[PDB]
Amino acid sequence: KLPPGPTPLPVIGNILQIGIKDISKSLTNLSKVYGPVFTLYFGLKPIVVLHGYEAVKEALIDLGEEFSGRGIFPLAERANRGFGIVFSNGKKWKEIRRFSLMTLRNFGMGKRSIEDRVQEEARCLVEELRKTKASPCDPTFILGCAPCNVICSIIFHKRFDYKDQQFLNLMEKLNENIKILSSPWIQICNNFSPIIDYFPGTHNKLLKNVAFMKSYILEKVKEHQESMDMNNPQDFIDCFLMKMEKEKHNQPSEFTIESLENTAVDLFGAGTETTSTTLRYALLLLLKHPEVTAKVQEEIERVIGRNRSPCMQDRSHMPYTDAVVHEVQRYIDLLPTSLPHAVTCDIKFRNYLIPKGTTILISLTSVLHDNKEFPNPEMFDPHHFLDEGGNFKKSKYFMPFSAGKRICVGEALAGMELFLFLTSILQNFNLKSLVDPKNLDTTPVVNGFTSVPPFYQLCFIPI
């Protein structure tokens, strides 16, 4: 049988009982009644929730292959999203993911490293920040340009000037779609309608925005097909075309210009908003806890100095800053329920039997805010990742990127972006708040499955 859960109602299941304001809090409430594994019904669609480290670990890690599916919902069909990496399944997923991970290794695309691309972007970021001339600033836009440009550089090999209008169009389309996708109407309510789409104009805008991006990618790809040097692949496209070559004699192949376009859009989608938000939240928490910022700066001064860019090598000698980055991630809990999973076959879990294809919802919040691993999990405190001697203290509960076979492809990349961008900023600036560090609230603003920071402004004061 399935795991227990609140008795669903006829037809609507458990829908009218789950506080949609903050699904994560609701799942936690439920776990207080039904335990670490329970079922909920969306219509007659069951969804098994895993809550707590032990349950998430055995599912995602111990029974990893069985829980490597991506749970699909009507929205997947409606915004054409099952044809790259994030929303794919089976062989298509495995091959594209595998290829993607290899291509994204630090030196996976030629002599120019991922680190180098990030470092260059950090340089540009500091520059654009300087241009604010220390005036009040809503850093949303600037912080979003950086991670986006890193993807551009990884995919097209070229970064854009922050005012190159083709760059500005890309970001606009991305931002638009993200905002749309973040509406509870689109995340929740539209998914009740199994066969009929109630927001047709919206799904049309989404697709239109994608079309524009794919059509920009297509042009870059033609240019790349032209100046193809087989022995010197320089970006994700070069690599993807070279994989295509090895595939000839392997029809049909998972690698096609279509899947390339789709994969590249996924990278843009997955690689630019979460990192960008996490950067934005970090500055806010640093404004709120200036003593933390000061220590990060003391480590930057001592280990890196002022005569050179930060680099990944410096991280191991900067336990405190490392602890800070980790803590930001843990505290903010950006993807409280990760992305939905689905079992790939009939499976026995604990004392229950979960049928193949059943949707699985993982509570990352439950792990990240584990009250024993992280006393006072609701408070921001770098000491959560530090030992008595001030050394960095790793945690099995550090899962902001999820865990298992579906773990974030960008785990390493995001790590580099956070560390390098944050160190760079604080190497060249002090942060000044408009209001008083005692007044601003840093509590995340939850809306359905989304969790973001509140609005704020600051001044980047050159050192």
The CA distance from 255 to 251, in Å, is 10
Contact 409, 100 (CB under 8 A): yes
Inter-CA distances, 444 with 22, 205, 211, 289, 333, Å:
11, 28, 33, 16, 9
Q: Residue 10 has which token pair?
A: 């006829």
Residues in contact with ligand LSN by the rule CB under 6 A: 42, 72-73, 75-76, 79, 81, 86, 173-174, 177-178, 181-182, 187-188, 191, 199-202, 204-206, 208-210, 213, 265-266, 268-270, 335-340, 449-450
Query: Least distance in Å: CB of 25 to ligand LSN?
Result: 12
Query: Least distance in Å: CB of 400 to ligand HEM?
Result: 5
The CA distance from 70 to 339, in Å, is 8
Q: Residue 201 has which token pair?
A: 């104009």
- Find all residues with CB under 8 Å of 428, minimum gap 6, and list them: 126, 129, 130, 462, 463
Query: Could you tell which of ligand HEM, ligand LSN, K ion, none binds residue 206, using a CB distance below 5 to 8 A set by kind?
Result: ligand LSN
Nearer to ligand LSN, 324 or 335 (CB): 335
Nearer to ligand HEM, 100 or 428 (CB): 100
- Best CA proximity match to 407, nearest among 167, 72, 73, 100: 100
- Binding test (CB under 5 A) with K ion, winner from 10, 201, 252, 305: 201
- Find all residues with CB under 8 Å of 131, minimum gap 6, and list them: none
Pairing of strands 450-452, 347-349: unpaired
Nearer to ligand HEM, 190 or 338 (CB): 338
Q: Is 408 annotated as a binding residue?
A: yes
Query: Could you tell which of K ion, ligand HEM, ligand LSN, none binds residue 402, using a CB distance below 5 to 8 A set by kind?
Result: ligand HEM
Per CB under 5 A, the segment of 194-202, 206-214, 249-257, 278-286 that binds K ion is 194-202
Identify whether 355 is preceded by a cis peptide bond (ω within 30 of 0): no
Nearer to ligand HEM, 3 or 400 (CB): 400
Per CB under 5 A, the segment of 36-44, 97-105, 156-164, 201-209 that binds K ion is 201-209
Nearer to ligand HEM, 8 or 114 (CB): 114
Please give the sequence-ordered ranges of beta strands (E in DSSP) within 245-399, or none if there are none.
341-342, 347-349, 352-354, 359-362
Q: Which residue is nearest to ligand LSN (CB)?
A: 269
The CA distance from 101 to 105, in Å, is 6
Query: Could you tell which of K ion, ligand LSN, ligand HEM, none binds residue 76, using a CB distance below 5 to 8 A set by kind?
Result: ligand LSN
Residues in contact with ligand HEM by the rule CB under 6 A: 70, 85-86, 97, 266-267, 270-271, 274-275, 278, 334-335, 338-339, 400-402, 406, 408-410, 413-414
Query: Least distance in Å: CB of 223 to ligand HEM?
Result: 22
The CA distance from 331 to 171, in Å, is 27
Query: Could you tell which of K ion, ligand LSN, ligand HEM, none binds residue 175, using a CB distance below 5 to 8 A set by kind?
Result: none
